[PDB]
UniProtKB/Swiss-Prot annotation:
This is Protein deacetylase HDAC6. It comes from the Eukaryota. The gene is HDAC6. It is found in: Cytoplasm; Cytoplasm, Cytoskeleton; Nucleus; Perikaryon. A zinc finger (UBP-type) spans 4-100. Zn(2+) 3 binds at residues 38, 41, 57, 63. Zn(2+) 1 binds at residues 6, 8, 76, 79.
């Protein structure tokens, strides 16, 4: 199971009123594959198995927590773990409505 809390949930920012687009491509390479959205600034970048742009974004922003547009899991780069908590329910559900 994921961690039930982490000390970076404080950095999760309010969801844009535009909502989320789970088909949004990577902001850097344009791939449609394995994208994640950053839960601090809501930019979308690809996962480590494509071109690793979300990991790069973490490195040059320090933003902690990212949501997968594949399965709606949330990863913390600092804790190196999946996290789930009530603070993540609204953004997961917006993503779920857009995806399914
Ligand atoms: C299981 O998810 C990850 N494990 C990682 C391990 C080491 C380094 C980065 C990692 N990033 C993710 C998920 C987000 C991503 O793919 O960028
Ligand atoms: Zn990319
Ligand atoms: Zn960010
Ligand atoms: Zn964390």
């Amino acid at each position: 199971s994921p961690l039930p809390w982490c000390p970076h949930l404080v950095a999760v920012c309010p969801i844009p009123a535009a909502g989320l687009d789970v088909t949004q491509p990577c902001g850097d390479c344009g791939t449609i594959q394995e994208n994640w959205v950053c839960l601090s600034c809501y930019q979308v970048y690809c996962g480590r198995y494509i071109n690793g742009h979300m990991l790069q974004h973490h490195g040059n922003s320090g933003h902690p927590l990212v949501l997968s547009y594949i399965d709606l899991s949330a990863w913390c780069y600092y804790c190196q773990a999946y996290v789930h908590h009530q603070a993540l329910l609204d953004v997961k559900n917006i993503a779920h409505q857009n995806k399914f």
